[PDB]
């Protein structure tokens, strides 16, 4: 009737040919986006190293590994890094970096694996747990909520948290959506991590379902061609009650705003909200 | 405005979430299949190693690397191996193996890179040449004829031949499509490169455009362990005919080479009784 | 990685249902345009009132649809010319006219296919109609993929250049000023019909309302539609320039005159205009 | 999640905007094509009218109505005609014609309704039967074999035969797919039902599933007056033997069945290879 016949199943690959969509105009521009932003801010390195060291943390778990940029740093600082991610296409880059530098004893002890928050417990042979777990770069917002009850989110944090050893730390952040939703416009290049050395026109698209923010989409453009990403607009208010219950209350919360601590009714409006937690009980 | 709107563009990934279609049912079963092909027959190893010694081939370029099964073997047998593929999804498994065995010196000198046949001259640094170039497992057939004049085929073969240094060897194969086209069905699961431990049922679809074969599509129905469970996936191939391919691979060297064809590791005499499942063309480059 | 179709998009063939003609979504949608083909006496009264007290007789419906609004004006001896861009909507108007072809009135009912964007060439007028109606919030159905409302200006410029001088134009649109604000579009407001679970989805691009989508439900199946959220403020300056200023613009709100800073918040804003010059 | 957000559900329309894909390039060229087929040959009219008189057939049911070309003819020639199709997009043109000529009494008594072969027993009120039932223009081939066992084909034929009253006539055809399958190409544009005033190039694609023909796809490249654009359609390639067997079985083997090869009787093995095969079946009772 009106069905469509595909040469190969979706998700399937074959020796000799590029995988599906591997080199469209959108993936190509996107490649440059994850490359022309694989640089870090001294302010960032300072803060991150600061927090981690002054906690006795050494065995760190990055659950938003990505191209490994944040882990490659902790690896150069002698930390015991375990980089993990659900995206094999993002991971390709972390691994490629580790192999190029396999001669450096540090990069030889760098564990890079594939894991999914939704099943992190079984995907990652932890056991002893880690001193610190990091999920920075606004990566958690990448996880949508197609279920409709944030349940998907609770499982993700419940799992991410049950990966930290008692008395352990958890640095999980997310952009400031309370502000983006309000202003409808999300500043382009207004980061605090990567030094934007690329041209980027960002078109913010918020979708409100029954008056409730449901999603934020960004269309990055450069010259003629563009690509897009979507995030779940998390409210600093709602994220907090959410990240804490993932621990079961047994946590010593604290929230920064672009590395500086945060006080409600504050004067400076943060670009990113970083939530740090010590797994008390 | 009738046009679907994307959460994220096609071919873009994001930390925290699985890539585009990696967790689908077809991808899942397809993964059980490429992990089953990971096991070659004793006859095959003997033939390939036999063939590569008989010419002193030391440096080998595997241009259809895949999960690295054949490459992993030549690496263990002392060869200088550089593997290459256009598919990151499959190359991922090769890299993973080379990493686990990074402590074995032979594996630390095993080069694995991404490269596409159509742009092989630029994707891989040679200039000199390779003792032997292999493209086995019926991989070349994955390349379709989009334009209709097999120009991509000639360009891919040309770039592939280019990698063979003078006096070099090129071993490339394809399934017997002369037989598949004639009977419309693909031989009774009997494979000679690998032992298929997994159970499968194969539906063959041939498409003919203006009476000229243009494509063969195989739908594999696998009995997944669990669920006696039945799920499936599909793959397509350009049905290369022995005559057509012999003509094409020679033309890639400029007709400047010695060319002989095997029928399942044994020499093939036109008209022979035994109908081969695969045809292996072995070409020695004049100079 | 191409996909292959047995037949092109838009093509039909003798013997088989057209593409998507009977999915679970179209089926529910059929009931939606059927379980709402009824009218409100308040509506009939207001519409007949306005039209008659203007000497209007030759009326042009540019949002014909299933013909429900025209079938009314036809039963009231008006000279009706029902037009629409949707052949699938029209199928219903025509089907009604043929069933009632014996009634001299329904035999003089002209039902054609026309597109606002090309109304000038699609509809042979020359003279101009006494009245033109585009009710039911139909104009909001036209999106703005162009990005500069230009598509909208052409639609009105054409819809207007279809009215004879001294002629009337009744074009309405739901109250989006309110929907955007409350995020929830009033579900089931008896002002046009008397028929569902509506899920409003607003999309703001760079802080600018860009679209409103409604997901209608029935129990285990649903369908959806999208509209351009027009602001009573922006629509006005828009509908007037389509005439070139030469018009006595007036705005109602649920069949009654509207006054800014009013107390009652309208469900629909009806814009009436007399083509002065 | 990698799902896509629709502006409107598939198959839903909205006043003011063109339906789903009505204004595309393929639809546009496809429209030039169905408006070109609107013109039958003198040989065809003579044969069909000949055939329908030779049996006294008065009430005729056209089960593959389309734009109503054949129906419009039988209406002019005095028959009692009820046309029917599953495609509203095509039925639109038939209705439009009947409306323009509503003043001609023959056209006011011309019934046109939507009905699907698979549900013909319920879609059309008969119970009694029709003198003759026609399904020409190689329309039955539009019905694909989704399930793989031709069950839909048997169900559609059965419902179609049902409409033929005892002593009735059923005229149904299909192109010569025995020839198309063998040579992989569709005959040199020579058509016998209609005069093709429009220029066309046809690429034929045959798909064989397990060595059994399953589909024929035609890509028509039309030389549009002005400015070369194209559209595609697919068909189930019915073989004469298979179809003869199927149409008889639809009557329960209770009927007389003869096949024509382009309006002329077909003797197996004849020299002239027909473009179309017309099966004419008289229903025993
Ligand atoms: C749609 N099809 C179909 C089905 N069965 C089911 N259940 N559903 C279907 O949709 N049976 C097979 C049939 C196959 N149809 C087609 C139509 C066109 C092409 C085609 O054009 N194929 C060429 C490429 C042409 C080009 O790239 O321009 C090919 O290599 O597949 C293939 C198969
Ligand atoms: C994908 N989505 C989704 C879901 N729920 C489920 N189950 N599955 C899904 O895929 N919830 C709604 C969400 C909607 N996402 C989006 C993303 C982008 C646009 C968008 O760009 N919309 C504009 C047009 C923009 C343009 O044309 O450039 C629009 O008018 O819809 C809309 C909705």
mmCIF file with all atom_site columns, C-alpha atoms in Angstrom, chain D residues 26-199:
data_model
loop_
_atom_site.group_PDB
_atom_site.id
_atom_site.type_symbol
_atom_site.label_atom_id
_atom_site.label_alt_id
_atom_site.label_comp_id
_atom_site.label_asym_id
_atom_site.label_entity_id
_atom_site.label_seq_id
_atom_site.pdbx_PDB_ins_code
_atom_site.Cartn_x
_atom_site.Cartn_y
_atom_site.Cartn_z
_atom_site.occupancy
_atom_site.B_iso_or_equiv
_atom_site.pdbx_formal_charge
_atom_site.auth_seq_id
_atom_site.auth_comp_id
_atom_site.auth_asym_id
_atom_site.auth_atom_id
_atom_site.pdbx_PDB_model_num
ATOM 1   C CA . UNK D 1 26  ? 4.613   14.724  -8.668  1.00 0.00 ? 26  UNK D CA 1
ATOM 2   C CA . UNK D 1 27  ? 0.940   15.403  -7.934  1.00 0.00 ? 27  UNK D CA 1
ATOM 3   C CA . UNK D 1 28  ? 0.965   18.214  -10.514 1.00 0.00 ? 28  UNK D CA 1
ATOM 4   C CA . UNK D 1 29  ? 2.424   16.051  -13.274 1.00 0.00 ? 29  UNK D CA 1
ATOM 5   C CA . UNK D 1 30  ? 0.243   13.120  -12.191 1.00 0.00 ? 30  UNK D CA 1
ATOM 6   C CA . UNK D 1 31  ? -2.736  15.396  -12.768 1.00 0.00 ? 31  UNK D CA 1
ATOM 7   C CA . UNK D 1 32  ? -1.646  16.095  -16.348 1.00 0.00 ? 32  UNK D CA 1
ATOM 8   C CA . UNK D 1 33  ? -1.571  12.347  -16.792 1.00 0.00 ? 33  UNK D CA 1
ATOM 9   C CA . UNK D 1 34  ? -5.055  11.463  -15.578 1.00 0.00 ? 34  UNK D CA 1
ATOM 10  C CA . UNK D 1 35  ? -6.441  14.307  -17.650 1.00 0.00 ? 35  UNK D CA 1
ATOM 11  C CA . UNK D 1 36  ? -4.776  12.859  -20.739 1.00 0.00 ? 36  UNK D CA 1
ATOM 12  C CA . UNK D 1 37  ? -6.201  9.372   -20.249 1.00 0.00 ? 37  UNK D CA 1
ATOM 13  C CA . UNK D 1 38  ? -9.519  11.220  -20.377 1.00 0.00 ? 38  UNK D CA 1
ATOM 14  C CA . UNK D 1 39  ? -10.147 10.280  -24.005 1.00 0.00 ? 39  UNK D CA 1
ATOM 15  C CA . UNK D 1 40  ? -10.945 6.749   -25.197 1.00 0.00 ? 40  UNK D CA 1
ATOM 16  C CA . UNK D 1 41  ? -10.302 5.229   -28.636 1.00 0.00 ? 41  UNK D CA 1
ATOM 17  C CA . UNK D 1 42  ? -13.090 4.503   -31.110 1.00 0.00 ? 42  UNK D CA 1
ATOM 18  C CA . UNK D 1 43  ? -12.184 0.811   -31.096 1.00 0.00 ? 43  UNK D CA 1
ATOM 19  C CA . UNK D 1 44  ? -12.618 0.605   -27.316 1.00 0.00 ? 44  UNK D CA 1
ATOM 20  C CA . UNK D 1 45  ? -16.044 2.318   -27.207 1.00 0.00 ? 45  UNK D CA 1
ATOM 21  C CA . UNK D 1 46  ? -17.253 0.125   -30.037 1.00 0.00 ? 46  UNK D CA 1
ATOM 22  C CA . UNK D 1 47  ? -16.085 -3.021  -28.211 1.00 0.00 ? 47  UNK D CA 1
ATOM 23  C CA . UNK D 1 48  ? -17.487 -2.152  -24.792 1.00 0.00 ? 48  UNK D CA 1
ATOM 24  C CA . UNK D 1 49  ? -20.824 -0.863  -26.090 1.00 0.00 ? 49  UNK D CA 1
ATOM 25  C CA . UNK D 1 50  ? -20.837 -3.847  -28.396 1.00 0.00 ? 50  UNK D CA 1
ATOM 26  C CA . UNK D 1 51  ? -20.260 -6.204  -25.482 1.00 0.00 ? 51  UNK D CA 1
ATOM 27  C CA . UNK D 1 52  ? -22.853 -4.596  -23.237 1.00 0.00 ? 52  UNK D CA 1
ATOM 28  C CA . UNK D 1 53  ? -25.615 -4.638  -25.901 1.00 0.00 ? 53  UNK D CA 1
ATOM 29  C CA . UNK D 1 54  ? -24.935 -8.237  -26.933 1.00 0.00 ? 54  UNK D CA 1
ATOM 30  C CA . UNK D 1 55  ? -26.249 -9.208  -23.473 1.00 0.00 ? 55  UNK D CA 1
ATOM 31  C CA . UNK D 1 56  ? -28.958 -6.599  -22.930 1.00 0.00 ? 56  UNK D CA 1
ATOM 32  C CA . UNK D 1 57  ? -27.113 -5.244  -19.926 1.00 0.00 ? 57  UNK D CA 1
ATOM 33  C CA . UNK D 1 58  ? -29.014 -2.165  -18.698 1.00 0.00 ? 58  UNK D CA 1
ATOM 34  C CA . UNK D 1 59  ? -27.899 -1.553  -15.087 1.00 0.00 ? 59  UNK D CA 1
ATOM 35  C CA . UNK D 1 60  ? -24.122 -1.286  -14.910 1.00 0.00 ? 60  UNK D CA 1
ATOM 36  C CA . UNK D 1 61  ? -21.878 -0.976  -11.881 1.00 0.00 ? 61  UNK D CA 1
ATOM 37  C CA . UNK D 1 62  ? -18.477 0.555   -12.537 1.00 0.00 ? 62  UNK D CA 1
ATOM 38  C CA . UNK D 1 63  ? -16.381 -0.640  -9.561  1.00 0.00 ? 63  UNK D CA 1
ATOM 39  C CA . UNK D 1 64  ? -13.207 1.257   -10.550 1.00 0.00 ? 64  UNK D CA 1
ATOM 40  C CA . UNK D 1 65  ? -14.855 4.547   -11.458 1.00 0.00 ? 65  UNK D CA 1
ATOM 41  C CA . UNK D 1 66  ? -11.844 6.855   -11.299 1.00 0.00 ? 66  UNK D CA 1
ATOM 42  C CA . UNK D 1 67  ? -12.441 10.189  -13.031 1.00 0.00 ? 67  UNK D CA 1
ATOM 43  C CA . UNK D 1 68  ? -15.541 8.615   -14.585 1.00 0.00 ? 68  UNK D CA 1
ATOM 44  C CA . UNK D 1 69  ? -14.483 8.423   -18.226 1.00 0.00 ? 69  UNK D CA 1
ATOM 45  C CA . UNK D 1 70  ? -15.982 5.036   -19.030 1.00 0.00 ? 70  UNK D CA 1
ATOM 46  C CA . UNK D 1 71  ? -18.945 5.756   -16.814 1.00 0.00 ? 71  UNK D CA 1
ATOM 47  C CA . UNK D 1 72  ? -19.623 9.079   -18.526 1.00 0.00 ? 72  UNK D CA 1
ATOM 48  C CA . UNK D 1 73  ? -19.801 7.141   -21.813 1.00 0.00 ? 73  UNK D CA 1
ATOM 49  C CA . UNK D 1 74  ? -22.245 4.437   -20.659 1.00 0.00 ? 74  UNK D CA 1
ATOM 50  C CA . UNK D 1 75  ? -24.380 7.234   -19.228 1.00 0.00 ? 75  UNK D CA 1
ATOM 51  C CA . UNK D 1 76  ? -24.607 8.962   -22.609 1.00 0.00 ? 76  UNK D CA 1
ATOM 52  C CA . UNK D 1 77  ? -25.445 5.667   -24.290 1.00 0.00 ? 77  UNK D CA 1
ATOM 53  C CA . UNK D 1 78  ? -28.545 5.249   -22.151 1.00 0.00 ? 78  UNK D CA 1
ATOM 54  C CA . UNK D 1 79  ? -27.424 2.775   -19.482 1.00 0.00 ? 79  UNK D CA 1
ATOM 55  C CA . UNK D 1 80  ? -28.370 2.848   -15.799 1.00 0.00 ? 80  UNK D CA 1
ATOM 56  C CA . UNK D 1 81  ? -24.998 3.656   -14.283 1.00 0.00 ? 81  UNK D CA 1
ATOM 57  C CA . UNK D 1 82  ? -23.735 3.517   -10.758 1.00 0.00 ? 82  UNK D CA 1
ATOM 58  C CA . UNK D 1 83  ? -20.054 4.370   -10.446 1.00 0.00 ? 83  UNK D CA 1
ATOM 59  C CA . UNK D 1 84  ? -17.882 3.650   -7.439  1.00 0.00 ? 84  UNK D CA 1
ATOM 60  C CA . UNK D 1 85  ? -14.321 4.178   -6.239  1.00 0.00 ? 85  UNK D CA 1
ATOM 61  C CA . UNK D 1 86  ? -12.250 4.151   -3.057  1.00 0.00 ? 86  UNK D CA 1
ATOM 62  C CA . UNK D 1 87  ? -10.312 7.224   -4.177  1.00 0.00 ? 87  UNK D CA 1
ATOM 63  C CA . UNK D 1 88  ? -11.944 10.527  -3.326  1.00 0.00 ? 88  UNK D CA 1
ATOM 64  C CA . UNK D 1 89  ? -9.131  12.355  -5.135  1.00 0.00 ? 89  UNK D CA 1
ATOM 65  C CA . UNK D 1 90  ? -10.252 10.797  -8.416  1.00 0.00 ? 90  UNK D CA 1
ATOM 66  C CA . UNK D 1 91  ? -13.976 10.578  -7.676  1.00 0.00 ? 91  UNK D CA 1
ATOM 67  C CA . UNK D 1 92  ? -13.822 14.363  -7.326  1.00 0.00 ? 92  UNK D CA 1
ATOM 68  C CA . UNK D 1 93  ? -13.501 14.647  -11.128 1.00 0.00 ? 93  UNK D CA 1
ATOM 69  C CA . UNK D 1 94  ? -16.421 12.305  -11.806 1.00 0.00 ? 94  UNK D CA 1
ATOM 70  C CA . UNK D 1 95  ? -18.730 14.200  -9.453  1.00 0.00 ? 95  UNK D CA 1
ATOM 71  C CA . UNK D 1 96  ? -17.600 17.482  -10.971 1.00 0.00 ? 96  UNK D CA 1
ATOM 72  C CA . UNK D 1 97  ? -18.639 16.261  -14.430 1.00 0.00 ? 97  UNK D CA 1
ATOM 73  C CA . UNK D 1 98  ? -21.998 14.935  -13.277 1.00 0.00 ? 98  UNK D CA 1
ATOM 74  C CA . UNK D 1 99  ? -22.646 18.310  -11.675 1.00 0.00 ? 99  UNK D CA 1
ATOM 75  C CA . UNK D 1 100 ? -21.854 20.365  -14.745 1.00 0.00 ? 100 UNK D CA 1
ATOM 76  C CA . UNK D 1 101 ? -24.266 18.216  -16.711 1.00 0.00 ? 101 UNK D CA 1
ATOM 77  C CA . UNK D 1 102 ? -26.893 17.874  -13.990 1.00 0.00 ? 102 UNK D CA 1
ATOM 78  C CA . UNK D 1 103 ? -29.466 19.364  -16.409 1.00 0.00 ? 103 UNK D CA 1
ATOM 79  C CA . UNK D 1 104 ? -29.197 16.322  -18.698 1.00 0.00 ? 104 UNK D CA 1
ATOM 80  C CA . UNK D 1 105 ? -31.661 13.782  -17.177 1.00 0.00 ? 105 UNK D CA 1
ATOM 81  C CA . UNK D 1 106 ? -29.308 10.841  -17.874 1.00 0.00 ? 106 UNK D CA 1
ATOM 82  C CA . UNK D 1 107 ? -26.677 12.513  -15.711 1.00 0.00 ? 107 UNK D CA 1
ATOM 83  C CA . UNK D 1 108 ? -29.127 13.295  -12.920 1.00 0.00 ? 108 UNK D CA 1
ATOM 84  C CA . UNK D 1 109 ? -29.797 9.575   -12.562 1.00 0.00 ? 109 UNK D CA 1
ATOM 85  C CA . UNK D 1 110 ? -26.076 8.748   -12.522 1.00 0.00 ? 110 UNK D CA 1
ATOM 86  C CA . UNK D 1 111 ? -25.153 7.420   -9.079  1.00 0.00 ? 111 UNK D CA 1
ATOM 87  C CA . UNK D 1 112 ? -21.624 8.018   -7.838  1.00 0.00 ? 112 UNK D CA 1
ATOM 88  C CA . UNK D 1 113 ? -20.512 6.749   -4.430  1.00 0.00 ? 113 UNK D CA 1
ATOM 89  C CA . UNK D 1 114 ? -17.368 5.925   -2.448  1.00 0.00 ? 114 UNK D CA 1
ATOM 90  C CA . UNK D 1 115 ? -16.844 2.214   -1.875  1.00 0.00 ? 115 UNK D CA 1
ATOM 91  C CA . UNK D 1 116 ? -13.842 -0.078  -1.385  1.00 0.00 ? 116 UNK D CA 1
ATOM 92  C CA . UNK D 1 117 ? -13.583 -3.479  -3.039  1.00 0.00 ? 117 UNK D CA 1
ATOM 93  C CA . UNK D 1 118 ? -12.520 -5.101  0.236   1.00 0.00 ? 118 UNK D CA 1
ATOM 94  C CA . UNK D 1 119 ? -15.766 -3.926  1.851   1.00 0.00 ? 119 UNK D CA 1
ATOM 95  C CA . UNK D 1 120 ? -17.947 -3.802  -1.265  1.00 0.00 ? 120 UNK D CA 1
ATOM 96  C CA . UNK D 1 121 ? -20.703 -5.984  0.174   1.00 0.00 ? 121 UNK D CA 1
ATOM 97  C CA . UNK D 1 122 ? -21.468 -3.291  2.765   1.00 0.00 ? 122 UNK D CA 1
ATOM 98  C CA . UNK D 1 123 ? -20.428 -0.141  0.891   1.00 0.00 ? 123 UNK D CA 1
ATOM 99  C CA . UNK D 1 124 ? -22.909 -0.643  -1.936  1.00 0.00 ? 124 UNK D CA 1
ATOM 100 C CA . UNK D 1 125 ? -26.630 -1.472  -1.600  1.00 0.00 ? 125 UNK D CA 1
ATOM 101 C CA . UNK D 1 126 ? -27.535 -4.155  -4.137  1.00 0.00 ? 126 UNK D CA 1
ATOM 102 C CA . UNK D 1 127 ? -28.852 -7.467  -2.840  1.00 0.00 ? 127 UNK D CA 1
ATOM 103 C CA . UNK D 1 128 ? -30.403 -7.949  -6.278  1.00 0.00 ? 128 UNK D CA 1
ATOM 104 C CA . UNK D 1 129 ? -27.446 -7.619  -8.631  1.00 0.00 ? 129 UNK D CA 1
ATOM 105 C CA . UNK D 1 130 ? -26.235 -5.714  -11.679 1.00 0.00 ? 130 UNK D CA 1
ATOM 106 C CA . UNK D 1 131 ? -26.662 -6.654  -15.301 1.00 0.00 ? 131 UNK D CA 1
ATOM 107 C CA . UNK D 1 132 ? -22.943 -6.061  -15.780 1.00 0.00 ? 132 UNK D CA 1
ATOM 108 C CA . UNK D 1 133 ? -19.991 -5.119  -13.595 1.00 0.00 ? 133 UNK D CA 1
ATOM 109 C CA . UNK D 1 134 ? -16.996 -3.408  -15.152 1.00 0.00 ? 134 UNK D CA 1
ATOM 110 C CA . UNK D 1 135 ? -13.461 -2.904  -13.808 1.00 0.00 ? 135 UNK D CA 1
ATOM 111 C CA . UNK D 1 136 ? -11.272 -1.791  -16.715 1.00 0.00 ? 136 UNK D CA 1
ATOM 112 C CA . UNK D 1 137 ? -8.211  0.347   -17.274 1.00 0.00 ? 137 UNK D CA 1
ATOM 113 C CA . UNK D 1 138 ? -6.012  -2.223  -15.502 1.00 0.00 ? 138 UNK D CA 1
ATOM 114 C CA . UNK D 1 139 ? -7.332  -0.994  -12.147 1.00 0.00 ? 139 UNK D CA 1
ATOM 115 C CA . UNK D 1 140 ? -7.479  -4.224  -10.191 1.00 0.00 ? 140 UNK D CA 1
ATOM 116 C CA . UNK D 1 141 ? -3.668  -4.387  -10.347 1.00 0.00 ? 141 UNK D CA 1
ATOM 117 C CA . UNK D 1 142 ? -3.489  -1.365  -8.070  1.00 0.00 ? 142 UNK D CA 1
ATOM 118 C CA . UNK D 1 143 ? -4.394  -3.647  -5.177  1.00 0.00 ? 143 UNK D CA 1
ATOM 119 C CA . UNK D 1 144 ? -1.153  -4.997  -3.646  1.00 0.00 ? 144 UNK D CA 1
ATOM 120 C CA . UNK D 1 145 ? -0.577  -8.288  -1.847  1.00 0.00 ? 145 UNK D CA 1
ATOM 121 C CA . UNK D 1 146 ? 0.437   -7.036  1.585   1.00 0.00 ? 146 UNK D CA 1
ATOM 122 C CA . UNK D 1 147 ? -0.100  -10.284 3.484   1.00 0.00 ? 147 UNK D CA 1
ATOM 123 C CA . UNK D 1 148 ? 1.795   -12.300 0.871   1.00 0.00 ? 148 UNK D CA 1
ATOM 124 C CA . UNK D 1 149 ? -0.922  -14.903 0.222   1.00 0.00 ? 149 UNK D CA 1
ATOM 125 C CA . UNK D 1 150 ? -3.156  -12.902 -2.136  1.00 0.00 ? 150 UNK D CA 1
ATOM 126 C CA . UNK D 1 151 ? -5.987  -13.074 0.401   1.00 0.00 ? 151 UNK D CA 1
ATOM 127 C CA . UNK D 1 152 ? -6.932  -9.437  -0.309  1.00 0.00 ? 152 UNK D CA 1
ATOM 128 C CA . UNK D 1 153 ? -7.107  -10.273 -4.007  1.00 0.00 ? 153 UNK D CA 1
ATOM 129 C CA . UNK D 1 154 ? -9.530  -13.136 -3.413  1.00 0.00 ? 154 UNK D CA 1
ATOM 130 C CA . UNK D 1 155 ? -11.623 -11.038 -1.065  1.00 0.00 ? 155 UNK D CA 1
ATOM 131 C CA . UNK D 1 156 ? -11.825 -8.111  -3.512  1.00 0.00 ? 156 UNK D CA 1
ATOM 132 C CA . UNK D 1 157 ? -12.705 -10.360 -6.474  1.00 0.00 ? 157 UNK D CA 1
ATOM 133 C CA . UNK D 1 158 ? -15.290 -12.211 -4.388  1.00 0.00 ? 158 UNK D CA 1
ATOM 134 C CA . UNK D 1 159 ? -16.984 -8.971  -3.362  1.00 0.00 ? 159 UNK D CA 1
ATOM 135 C CA . UNK D 1 160 ? -16.817 -7.729  -6.944  1.00 0.00 ? 160 UNK D CA 1
ATOM 136 C CA . UNK D 1 161 ? -18.348 -10.913 -8.356  1.00 0.00 ? 161 UNK D CA 1
ATOM 137 C CA . UNK D 1 162 ? -21.061 -10.773 -5.724  1.00 0.00 ? 162 UNK D CA 1
ATOM 138 C CA . UNK D 1 163 ? -22.390 -7.603  -7.409  1.00 0.00 ? 163 UNK D CA 1
ATOM 139 C CA . UNK D 1 164 ? -23.129 -9.551  -10.616 1.00 0.00 ? 164 UNK D CA 1
ATOM 140 C CA . UNK D 1 165 ? -26.719 -10.832 -10.690 1.00 0.00 ? 165 UNK D CA 1
ATOM 141 C CA . UNK D 1 166 ? -27.315 -14.377 -12.028 1.00 0.00 ? 166 UNK D CA 1
ATOM 142 C CA . UNK D 1 167 ? -26.945 -14.430 -15.811 1.00 0.00 ? 167 UNK D CA 1
ATOM 143 C CA . UNK D 1 168 ? -24.910 -11.277 -15.269 1.00 0.00 ? 168 UNK D CA 1
ATOM 144 C CA . UNK D 1 169 ? -21.687 -10.088 -16.837 1.00 0.00 ? 169 UNK D CA 1
ATOM 145 C CA . UNK D 1 170 ? -18.317 -9.230  -15.284 1.00 0.00 ? 170 UNK D CA 1
ATOM 146 C CA . UNK D 1 171 ? -15.701 -7.499  -17.416 1.00 0.00 ? 171 UNK D CA 1
ATOM 147 C CA . UNK D 1 172 ? -12.333 -7.128  -15.691 1.00 0.00 ? 172 UNK D CA 1
ATOM 148 C CA . UNK D 1 173 ? -8.873  -6.679  -17.174 1.00 0.00 ? 173 UNK D CA 1
ATOM 149 C CA . UNK D 1 174 ? -5.170  -6.464  -16.446 1.00 0.00 ? 174 UNK D CA 1
ATOM 150 C CA . UNK D 1 175 ? -2.101  -5.634  -18.485 1.00 0.00 ? 175 UNK D CA 1
ATOM 151 C CA . UNK D 1 176 ? -0.031  -8.459  -19.899 1.00 0.00 ? 176 UNK D CA 1
ATOM 152 C CA . UNK D 1 177 ? 2.368   -8.973  -17.018 1.00 0.00 ? 177 UNK D CA 1
ATOM 153 C CA . UNK D 1 178 ? 3.591   -12.261 -18.464 1.00 0.00 ? 178 UNK D CA 1
ATOM 154 C CA . UNK D 1 179 ? 5.376   -10.152 -21.057 1.00 0.00 ? 179 UNK D CA 1
ATOM 155 C CA . UNK D 1 180 ? 6.451   -7.312  -18.731 1.00 0.00 ? 180 UNK D CA 1
ATOM 156 C CA . UNK D 1 181 ? 7.966   -9.754  -16.242 1.00 0.00 ? 181 UNK D CA 1
ATOM 157 C CA . UNK D 1 182 ? 9.839   -11.648 -18.983 1.00 0.00 ? 182 UNK D CA 1
ATOM 158 C CA . UNK D 1 183 ? 11.403  -8.603  -20.659 1.00 0.00 ? 183 UNK D CA 1
ATOM 159 C CA . UNK D 1 184 ? 11.529  -6.400  -17.558 1.00 0.00 ? 184 UNK D CA 1
ATOM 160 C CA . UNK D 1 185 ? 10.132  -3.497  -19.601 1.00 0.00 ? 185 UNK D CA 1
ATOM 161 C CA . UNK D 1 186 ? 6.590   -2.210  -20.239 1.00 0.00 ? 186 UNK D CA 1
ATOM 162 C CA . UNK D 1 187 ? 5.518   -2.222  -23.953 1.00 0.00 ? 187 UNK D CA 1
ATOM 163 C CA . UNK D 1 188 ? 6.354   0.832   -26.186 1.00 0.00 ? 188 UNK D CA 1
ATOM 164 C CA . UNK D 1 189 ? 3.717   3.276   -24.879 1.00 0.00 ? 189 UNK D CA 1
ATOM 165 C CA . UNK D 1 190 ? 1.177   1.775   -27.287 1.00 0.00 ? 190 UNK D CA 1
ATOM 166 C CA . UNK D 1 191 ? -2.104  1.840   -25.372 1.00 0.00 ? 191 UNK D CA 1
ATOM 167 C CA . UNK D 1 192 ? -5.441  0.563   -26.668 1.00 0.00 ? 192 UNK D CA 1
ATOM 168 C CA . UNK D 1 193 ? -7.990  2.101   -24.271 1.00 0.00 ? 193 UNK D CA 1
ATOM 169 C CA . UNK D 1 194 ? -6.863  5.690   -24.701 1.00 0.00 ? 194 UNK D CA 1
ATOM 170 C CA . UNK D 1 195 ? -4.916  7.964   -27.015 1.00 0.00 ? 195 UNK D CA 1
ATOM 171 C CA . UNK D 1 196 ? -1.922  9.370   -25.146 1.00 0.00 ? 196 UNK D CA 1
ATOM 172 C CA . UNK D 1 197 ? -1.484  12.919  -26.436 1.00 0.00 ? 197 UNK D CA 1
ATOM 173 C CA . UNK D 1 198 ? 1.132   13.537  -23.736 1.00 0.00 ? 198 UNK D CA 1
ATOM 174 C CA . UNK D 1 199 ? 4.796   12.533  -24.147 1.00 0.00 ? 199 UNK D CA 1
#
